[PDB]
Amino acid sequence: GSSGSSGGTGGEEPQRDKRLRTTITPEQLEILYQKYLLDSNPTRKMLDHIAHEVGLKKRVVQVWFQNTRARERKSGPSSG
């Protein structure tokens, strides 16, 4: 049970746009794949940020990771 943060700076309006879609894009995946390869065990915080920079439904970005892992771990390597 530990904590302790600091603050002191005016905030700014949130970010809203009609870009958030259910399905993923071939231009967004790249970012996800690159972020996954380097980080396959990210925390809610990361998932939130990444999904914010890539512009993809946080949920879709969060699950997309948990799903990929299961596959990677699932015995049975595929050599392309």
Curated annotation (Swiss-Prot):
Free-text tissue specificity from the UniProt record: Not found in normal gastric mucosa but found in gastric carcinoma cells (at protein level). Expression is higher in ER-positive breast tumors than ER-negative breast tumors (at protein level).
DNA-binding region, residue intervals: 17-74
Localization in the cell: Nucleus; Cytoplasm
Post-translational modification: Hyperphosphorylation protects ZFHX3 from calpain/CAPN1-mediated degradation. Ubiquitinated, leading to its proteasomal degradation.
Disease named in the record: Atrial fibrillation, familial, 8: A familial form of atrial fibrillation, a common sustained cardiac rhythm disturbance. Atrial fibrillation is characterized by disorganized atrial electrical activity and ineffective atrial contraction promoting blood stasis in the atria and reduces ventricular filling. It can result in palpitations, syncope, thromboembolic stroke, and congestive heart failure. Spinocerebellar ataxia 4: A form of spinocerebellar ataxia, a clinically and genetically heterogeneous group of cerebellar disorders. Patients show progressive incoordination of gait and often poor coordination of hands, speech and eye movements, due to degeneration of the cerebellum with variable involvement of the brainstem and spinal cord. SCA4 is characterized by the onset of balance disturbances and gait and limb ataxia usually in the fourth decade, although earlier onset in the teens or twenties has been reported. There is evidence of genetic anticipation within families.
Self-association state and partner proteins as the record states: Interacts with FNBP3. Interacts with ALKBH4 and PIAS3. Interacts with ESR1. Interacts with RUNX3. Interacts with TRIM25. Interacts with SMAD2 and SMAD3.
Function recorded in the entry: Transcriptional regulator which can act as an activator or a repressor. Inhibits the enhancer element of the AFP gene by binding to its AT-rich core sequence. In concert with SMAD-dependent TGF-beta signaling can repress the transcription of AFP via its interaction with SMAD2/3. Regulates the circadian locomotor rhythms via transcriptional activation of neuropeptidergic genes which are essential for intercellular synchrony and rhythm amplitude in the suprachiasmatic nucleus (SCN) of the brain.
Protein name (record): Zinc finger homeobox protein 3
Species this protein is from: Homo sapiens
Biological classification of the source: Eukaryota, Metazoa, Chordata, Craniata, Vertebrata
